[PDB]
Amino acid sequence: FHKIRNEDLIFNESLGQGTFTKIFKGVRREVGDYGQLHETEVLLKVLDKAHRNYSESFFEAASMMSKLSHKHLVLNYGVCVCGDENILVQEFVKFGSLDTYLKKNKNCINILWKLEVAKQLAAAMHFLEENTLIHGNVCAKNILLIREEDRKTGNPPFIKLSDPGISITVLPKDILQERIPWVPPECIENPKNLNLATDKWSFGTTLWEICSGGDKPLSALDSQRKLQFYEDRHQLPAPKAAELANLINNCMDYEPDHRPSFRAIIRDLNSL
Numbered sequence: 001f002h003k004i005r006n007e008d009l010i011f012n013e014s015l016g017q018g019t020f021t022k023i024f025k026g027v028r029r030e031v032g033d034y035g036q037l038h039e040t041e042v043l044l045k046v047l048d049k050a051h052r053n054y055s056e057s058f059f060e061a062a063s064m065m066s067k068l069s070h071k072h073l074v075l076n077y078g079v080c081v082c083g084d085e086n087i088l089v090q091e092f093v094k095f096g097s098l099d100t101y102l103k104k105n106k107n108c109i110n111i112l113w114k115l116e117v118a119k120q121l122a123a124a125m126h127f128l129e130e131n132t133l134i135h136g137n138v139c140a141k142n143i144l145l146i147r148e149e150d151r152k153t154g155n156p157p158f159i160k161l162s163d164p165g166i167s168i169t170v171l172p173k174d175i176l177q178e179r180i181p182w183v184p185p186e187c188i189e190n191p192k193n194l195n196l197a198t199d200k201w202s203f204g205t206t207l208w209e210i211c212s213g214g215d216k217p218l219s220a221l222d223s224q225r226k227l228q229f230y231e232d233r234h235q236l237p238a239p240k241a242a243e244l245a246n247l248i249n250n251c252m253d254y255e256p257d258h259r260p261s262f263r264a265i266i267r268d269l270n271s272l
């Protein structure tokens with residue numbers, strides 16, 4: 001990772017919190033192409049000082065995202081590890097993450113919008129699958145909206161997949177259980193089972209989010225009941241707009257080896 005000095009970063013408003021992290025809007029002062037000076041809007045993702053012992057996994061997450069370059073993967077600009085800070089500096093995405101956007105625009109997101117976003121996410125995951133690169137935390141909170149749909153010019157929405165954060169292979173068990181049903185059953189059994197099939201399950205859960213208007217699946221269940229949901233081999237209810245429900249359930253297969261390739265997922269989406 002490129003090293004960015006603290007002096008070149010300005011922290012502005014808080015945008016929220018993640019697992020052992022806090023996120024801010026900020027500005028990066030930099031020399032850009034042709035030697036021009038720029039003040040660039042950035043997302044600043046800060047590891048909590050109390051959780052400094054996760055710094056390797058925290059940065060390994062971003063390192064994953066920058067191993068490869070792709071139009072549907074968030075851009076990491078660098079890191080700031082001056083002083084006692086562990087900061088990831090990322091591109092600033094004006095419209096934020098899809099969990100919020102789906103709730104706020106629930107009245108005007110239709111089947112075609114959801115299909116286009118699902119296709120784009122499946123394209124990103126196919127690229128990761130072809131490169132045998134595990135993401136490990138696919139969810140609507142980690143999908144960023146670069147561009148809104150503009151029917152007046154035909155333009156579809158455009159999304160990117162953000163970094164997974166600290167890996168489920170190192171997080172406390174209680175956090176993994178709270179993350180059912182994004183974390184697949186085999187990873188609740190043994191977080192070391194994380195592998196490419198993990199991301200097919202979580203893609204199903206994310207498609208359920210995209211079809212459910214801001215709702216979080218199983219949010220009414222406490223952690224014990226989420227565990228028992230897996231023990232009883234239940235599936236998520238179909239979204240009211242159920243066009244993708246069979247794909248959701250085929251991806252959320254309790255047998256990891258039976259989950260379909262992202263090539264097959266893409267062919268299924270193109271059939272609709």
Ligand SMILES: Nc1cnc(-c2cc(N)nc3[nH]ccc23)cn1
Nearest residue numbers: 015016043091092093094095096
């Ligand atoms: N790479 C990223 C990631 N998230 C945002 C973002 C934008 C916004 N308008 N509100 C937000 N609220 C929380 C996060 C966020 C921006 N850029």
